[PDB]
């Protein structure tokens, strides 16, 4: 990896409850791709 | 564009909300920087 990954923004589902996620604020759409870096 | 956030445990109230799923190696409470590609 490298503390840095890419991921497609999705809509959370019932099966996601309890899973590690980051909440996506307004301005970034479902289907948009984001780069995520643990600092 | 770009934002800072902390990794959280998804809850029932998040169903239907915009999220990114966090892979293994990053824990709840970890600070991440997120930017749209």
The two three-digit tokens of residue A21, written as one number: 């996620």
Q: Give the C-alpha separation, B14 to A13, whole Å.
A: 8
Q: What was the structure determination method?
A: X-ray
Nearest to B4 by CA among B34, B37, B27: B34
Residues of chain B positioned with their CB less than 8 A from the CB of A39: 31-33
The two three-digit tokens of residue A7, written as one number: 């991921």
Beta bridge partners of A9: none
Residues of chain A positioned with their CB less than 8 A from the CB of B8: 20-23
The two three-digit tokens of residue A31, written as one number: 């289907």
Q: Are strands B31-36 and B8-9 parallel, antiparallel or unpaired?
A: unpaired
CB of B13 less than 8 A from some CB of A? no
CA dihedral B3, B8, B14, B15 (to 10 degrees): 110
Q: Which sequence spans correspond to the domains of chain B?
A: 2-35
Minimal Cβ distance to A12: which of B7, B19, B25:
B19
What residue has token string 């999705």? A10
Nearest to B3 by CA among B36, B37, B26, B34: B34
Beta bridge partners of A11: B18
């Amino acid at each position: 990896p490298g503390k840095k990954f890419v991921a497609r923004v999705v809509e959370a589902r019932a099966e996601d409850v309890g899973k590690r996620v980051v909440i996506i604020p307004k301005g970034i759409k479902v289907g948009d791709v984001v780069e995520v870096k643990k600092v």
